[model samples]
Target: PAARSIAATPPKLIVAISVDQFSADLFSEYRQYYTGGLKRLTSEGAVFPRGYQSHAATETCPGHSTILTGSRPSRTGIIANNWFDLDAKREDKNLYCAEDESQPGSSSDKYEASPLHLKVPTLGGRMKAANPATRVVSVAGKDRAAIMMGGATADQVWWLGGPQGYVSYKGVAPTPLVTQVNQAFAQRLAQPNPGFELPAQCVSKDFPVQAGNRTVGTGRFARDAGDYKGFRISPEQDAMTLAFAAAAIENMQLGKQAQTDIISIGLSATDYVGHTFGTEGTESCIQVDRLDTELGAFFDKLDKDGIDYVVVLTADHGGHDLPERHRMNAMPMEQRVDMALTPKALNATIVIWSDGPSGDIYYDALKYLRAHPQVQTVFTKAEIAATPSPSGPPESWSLIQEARASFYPSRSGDLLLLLKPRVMSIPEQAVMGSVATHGSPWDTDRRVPILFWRKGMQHFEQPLGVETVDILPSLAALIKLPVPKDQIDGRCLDLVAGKDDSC
Candidate 1:
């Protein structure tokens, strides 16, 4: 008999979900507790236990870009979530990965966002080009995830906008469902409630590293009035994002149309919670449980509607626990390092050397050298560009040299700062909250999970799954769309069939 076709009919809806900061380690740790939709998906579809981003920088924006695009951060030009734009007038101005800085008000916070920075087309973009009628909608708690997953021409893209409510680009108004969710959030805020108890299994885990008197445990973050802290830590934010997605599906009549509709949802609370409470404590456990329940309910709603949707859930990146927590647990290998010594700092050093005021270090090194003959002339950008970075472990700064060689010299910083394992970048004057943090090139912060599911699909785990870049190609293969092979850094894996067969 011919191999059974797993592809959905033409116009088959592709729902790509990204759970921010969801690591394969975290998932395996909490897999036993998943008795709902997550468990069902694991039991029904293809699961990649060892999915990886395979890049040096594992920040949120870069990691999100890898998925669905099947390209590495170097290929996509997303070095970090935010990078210092040397040409910009403002000092310390960070360029967001998803925003188009050229347009007025095109900032990560208040400006219209598009996929201008992304070098390659995403799964949604490919589908839309293949068929104009295919509607692409992306909703998430974070802007980068939404913008990256939706590509440049999504019909609708929405993300949580601080405490005010959900916001959109091009002056798009809030939907009724968004309003309702805001109302729910407001009601929860008014009457603050203590968080639910963590399960017994979670109690033994070492987590919630203390910073001074404050704690980042599994306790509730519900706030009253000026309590934005609660809004940042709990799964409520993810729930709100999901509610908006569900409403969009119903309001837009997604999956009911003749052409396929793509709905991308990014749950970001996990990342926030992980950052605050560490990856191995009761707080993370509670978050996963809440997320499991919420995801189950969200899937149940979709199933109730009888939508023939195929769901793919993955993560932007993994996380590492705070040094204090690891140290307390006798894992003494953890160490902290300073993060302020970057190439930008070298620019400041040049300015000081020139004695031409404090902040006027121009990229024209010859001019500065001519002005101050006494100051030792550091290597120019041209010199740095010509030199190859030394080869060694990632912990060594040799990788920075390699990065400088590859990246545009005009855009990059003058010095590169590499943080030692488990160190945080929080400034001394800044108010401390959570001790744990991510955004490094380490393995603990780079590995993630990729799962796929649909009714009647065979269940299996691919232990040697490829990098995040492969996601777009695999999906493209399933849908028979034209994916730019030359542009992407990933190759399609045989998800439906065994790895023995050639594509």
Candidate 2:
């Protein structure tokens, strides 16, 4: 009976969080210094140190689709942050994962936000189907994070859209609490910031590391009034998001409702921070410290409200430090990407012959790419589909298996390209705004931490690997919610202490 699966009283609220680009490496580096919310969760929770996103497309959209749906990107239909709609009869062929592309005159950047691309229902959606009164709310720094995790049927969804403050789907009215938070945030944004105080631990990391024509590692996040980019790249972005989330909980009376509710908060400053300045730098050190303090304050508000909430924190994806610093640290083998391996370079070399068979052209292109010095290997669509999607320990998955887990026939390209190990995908010299990037199939880009905590809950650390897809099924088990076996690709995790199953 499903009743037997229920081991304890269901929590009044489930707070699901996604920290963008928060790698397992970052957690281990800063965890020892955590004295706030991060510290509390690690010390008093079921911590999975080896959580895997479990797909080759280790980008934000694809990774988020797995966290709350118990499905891989292959099933979620979010193959990448952006994919080419080869058949689209339009000026631009690009398609974003969260946009309503059907809107007339809408382009990838200007399209309305929608959950149209998600092929599977989220945990929040399923909860609403089970209980009519259950409220699903989401707040994030990016639209993709909020849309993917909240699903289509959330009561409220909000994300920061430039300096205007939090926005929702077109035609959705802002609740009074959201309006209030936005007004307050606008006032804060209008003032100049003299930069945040850098922690003493970050002193050793302050040395400059060259990235393109610019030098980084000494940034203090100082900004002029209405400086949107500076605010977004700093740790203050996460603080604002958490503040809005707290306001939503207070005004909506989330956990106090009769039915179990869920709210997702996507903290995104880490991703921006990692991109602007490589990880393992002074800027990142300050971000980690500030994030810890911000999370603590948010949790304190919930405690003051006497809300019985269970919190589960994880990341959308992992990231790697820039190679410039890698070379300085005795890793001489690390190198920047070669220009010949880029998509633009490939397009220039692969010519479409008028008299040739399509298959012949495809093979010629594949052979050419494989022979390139910087290229590791290339897989055709048929070759990747022949392999089964991997399910065991993610650390040991074959390269083809990783591709299979990320492939969807309608969205994926005909040929898959992979670069050699430690070969970064960004330019040899960084751009003005971006330096570091992620989306590789390597461990540094695939590994994230998953933590769960509730008051008086048994604490245990499981270093064994688990996929992000398992999150939905594990949370389902906690509330004794019936889930269809065919709908999910993940197995439930054993969350209880001792020799018993939590599922």
Candidate 3:
């Protein structure tokens, strides 16, 4: 058989797209609904049915970091989206994974951000460093998603902002396309509109839940206002993201440049919808369908531009179905657990122990224990470093033990509270709506999809192999870039021909 040349003169552009919370299960189950661009990629790319993050922690920040960095949470130091910062003077200085906290007020919503927490350089960063002409751009619905994928020196980085319209680093204004999209988003969200209708194929799925005494079956999350919720979950949000990305590509002259340019696009609507309506429901189905259509449009835009690009699409992580829906469907193992095991809850517990103030519990616990000469020998950093970590669920995770075993102790939490399986950490103030959530250590939350496509490349599906970390090294090999051997945990997988090359 005469196969088309497996290699091309190195793609002028590499477009890495990560749709947050797009599970492998969801993609495979709803793949039939894809009629255009998604269908095209599925039919003409190397799709990995079992691609995984492969780490115990499957939260957004940690999982996103693994995709292109080729490293795990343990190696990357981004164990969670937000970790406890006991040494800080603030009541709860939760350290964000992608933000540079040292630059006062650089929290998730406040200031400029960088990939300071990530230990390794991302594929984009490495490429740009190797050749300065190579431009790296990252755009997403969420900041951490964009920052993690784009790495430290992205030429342009942007994410959806609260009320203030689309925002970027250092108070940078939105791009021309972003500005137009944001205006459209604001206008569309100002007036109330009937919610989306379930596609004919998805209407039969029984995913009902109790909403305010009336039984609301699976449907959609319709927003009537330009609030945070609307901006995050609505199909318009993804449209804006893709539009901005496409605009950035053209404005930056990405593929037309001498060196390869990278554009990282992360559609975060799936994650938002998953959190708002749960995965296996009608609302999620509608969201997925919208995503399929929106993604198809995005790809069509790229095609029309006639850019020489290789598209590598994947997800930050997977998500679980709502317990109510699962239970109704006869999965007895599926049930909503208590929502009081989150860090906030744990901090509240600490407050009780500290006489209504629990700032610096880990450090203070040691001091209090020392002053009293009792209370189980106050576990200090030094002592915790010496003790072995107790193994089990999050609730059973021994902070002292984990500290001793893990390489980075200072970056972790003092208490290290872990919620049991099926349990959530919904705060008391949180609205009781769609009760599904992720950001936990479970198989359902960890697995994701990996799809690769380039003109003239053979199409194949790997049913039972590959991890998210392998994506970088695989692309590195394809472009003949020298990947750092010591930093990554995964090897390159030859998608052109079904073979594994251990890098």
Candidate 4:
């Protein structure tokens, strides 16, 4: 019975945060230096340094689906951020995970944002179902983050939509608080942002490196007025996102209620910064520092409000630095993937290999892809499907198990591709868009740090691996909410110290 003991009182609010692309390696690299919120969390919280996304498709949409659902992407039906839908009758064959593509004249890029694609209910949705008084709110820098974490029954959801500040689902009207937040953003955007002051720690990393057509490693996220691209890629994006979240908490009176409320905040600038300027560059260093300071302010605001909140912070996925930096840092073997590895090029090869038999195209494609020098391994849909979901520590699972964790029958491709380790899959040059990216089954892409904090809670660190899917049931147990064990893929993590178990 002592092992089953839970917290004496349930927190009035739960703050679930996803710091996009905050890899375990990055956390380990910069955590000792963090004097702000990250330091506070790592020192005073129950920390899992070896937490994992635990799936092959280590992208935003699929990874977020696991955080609050206690399920993997295979169960959540979010195989990737974007997947091809060749069977669809619509003009656009590409599908965005959070979009309602069935909407009239809708395609992946221009479609209405919706949560219809996520097959599982999040912890917030389940809480609301148990108690209608519970309020669920989600805010993020990207639409997919908000949608996947909020699930279908969220009372309010908002994400940064370019110059519009924060926007919700298409038919939803903006609340007055949202309108006011937009006005503040508009005023801030009208003025040019001088580059952020580079900390002494970043001075050594400030040298220029050319990536593609653009030069990076020296940018401080400086922007002229109305520069959407600059703002989105900068730390300011996360600042605005957290500001909006704090404003929403205050305006909605989140914790001053009879029922426990939930808010999911997705900090997305790290991913953008990593993509634009690589993880080890000056740009990333600045973003990390700013994020720490910004998060400190956010937590301080909640303390000021006297909200009894439990915070869980993790990432949608981990990120990899560019091959250029990797090579310069004694990693002579690190290299960029060849252009022939692109899906289009591979598909073209498959077409040329076709005209054999009825089901021969599938095996032909698999064999051709496996033979590529750049590719490490290839799996047919049947091979992945036959492999049971892995129950071992995430780090110990085979590549097939990782693929199976992310595979959804209807959405996933017939063939799964795994590239050789350290092969960066981005354009050779650094542009405003992606220069470094993550979507591999490698440890660098799958490993993220998961931290949970509550005032007066016993703190401990676990270096052992844990999955993102375990978050929901752990929190549910903390709040004394019952979840059907059979419904979720994750087991509840015991958050209590000593002999007691929160689960």
Model 2 has how many clashing residue pairs?
Answer: 0
- TM-score of model 2 vs. true structure: 0.95
Candidate 1 local Cα displacement, residue 381, angstroms:
8.3
Error of 3 at 102 (Å): 2.7
Tell me the tens digit of each residue's lDDT in model 4 across 1-503.
01222366898999999999999988888887788889879988889999999999899999999999999998999988877676667888778889988888888778899999999999999999999999999999999999999999999989998897899987788889999999988887887999898877788888776666777788888899999888889998899899999999999999889899999999999999998888988899999999999999999999999898889999999999887777777898887777665655655656322211111122226667677777788788899889998898998999999999998888776677788888887635344366788888899999999999888777789899999999999999888899998899998888777787787
Cα lDDT tens digits, model 1, 1-503, are 12343453432677888999888789888888787777876767688877776665666888888787777665677766666564655333556677777676444354456678887777787788889998899888888888888888788888887777677775677677667767776665566545566666667763455655666554544445536567667877877788878888988889998877889998999998887777777778878888888889988998898887778888888887766677787887664442222335445544422111111123334554334422223334455567553333222334344344224444444533334545444322235665666665455666677887776666678776457777887777666777767777778766665534213
In order, what lDDT does every prediction score? Answer: 0.68, 0.84, 0.68, 0.86
lDDT for each residue of candidate 3 in 116-164, tens digit (9 for 90 to 100): 8888788998998899988998888898998898887887778876665
Better of 1 and 2 by lDDT: 2
Better of 3 and 4 by TM-score: 4
Per-model clash counts, in order, read 6, 0, 3, 4
Could you give me the TM-score of model 1 versus the true structure?
0.82
Give candidate 2's error at residue 434 in angstroms: 0.9
Shift in Å, residue 13, candidate 4: 0.2
Task: Give per-residue CA lDDT, model 2, range 1-503, as digits (tens).
Answer: 01222237888899999999999999888998998999888987889999998888889999989988999998999988887675676655677889978788888877888999999989999999999899999999999999999999999989999898999999888778978999988988898989877788888888999877888888888999899888989988899999999989888899998888999999999999999898989889999899889998998899889998888899999998888898888888887677655555655777322111111112227788678766678788888888887778987888778888889888777777777778777767445567787788888888999998877777889998999999999998888889887888887887787777788
lDDT comparison, 2 vs 4, better candidate: 4
Q: List the residue pairs that clash in candidate 3.
A: 389-401, 394-418, 395-418
